[PDB]
Amino acid sequence: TAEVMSHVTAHFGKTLEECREESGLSVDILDEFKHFWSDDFDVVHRELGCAIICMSNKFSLMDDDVRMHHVNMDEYIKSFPNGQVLAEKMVKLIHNCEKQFDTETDDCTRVVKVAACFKEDSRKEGIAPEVAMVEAVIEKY
């Protein structure tokens, strides 16, 4: 659901700053990860793809070939409150987008294209949060 997705996003995004230098991602491109979900934020930069790899690797969410690791992704999603309701659909959506961009060999560029596809499909399928819902989770700390 969009609510589970807010919890996932709020945790995943904590690794943004530690990943920023290696990925070449300027604060001008994305200052806080929560803004990935703004209707207004265009998911396009190669460097955002690189950052996504960095952040994913922190939790083993990529396989050997820099595609999602389905079982690690399932376990991660299920580590959040009510995660079981989102896990199946989220892995199926990401994997469907990966297949559409399988001819992109550049890992950073492929990952940002897949990220943009996933964002559009999460909206169509009703699992895309609003930035406010993501903030609400960050603001409980």
* Least distance to ligand B9M, CB of residue 101, Å: 8
Residues 6+ apart with CB under 8 A from 52: 111, 112, 115
Chain residues 14-73 in contact with ligand B9M, contact rule CB under 6 A? 36, 52, 56, 61, 67-68
132 to each of 47, 48, 128, how far by Cα in Å?
25, 21, 12
Of 114 and 133, CB closest to ligand B9M? 114
Residues 6+ apart with CB under 8 A from 122: 5, 93, 128
* Least distance to ligand B9M, CB of residue 59, Å: 8
What type of residue sits at position 109? Answer: T
Give the count of residues interacting with ligand B9M (CB under 6 A). 15
Quick one: which of 56, 51, 61, 11 has its CA closest to 30? 51
Residues 6+ apart with CB under 8 A from 2: 126, 127, 128, 129, 130, 133
Question: Per CB under 6 A, does 128 bind ligand B9M?
Answer: no
**25, 48, 94, 127: residue in contact with ligand B9M (rule CB under 6 A):** 94
**87, 114, 131, 134: residue in contact with ligand B9M (rule CB under 6 A):** 114
* Least distance to ligand B9M, CB of residue 138, Å: 14
Assigned token pair, 128: 């895309």
Name the residues that contact ligand B9M, by CB under 6 A: 8-9, 12, 36, 52, 56, 61, 67-68, 94, 98, 111, 114-115, 118
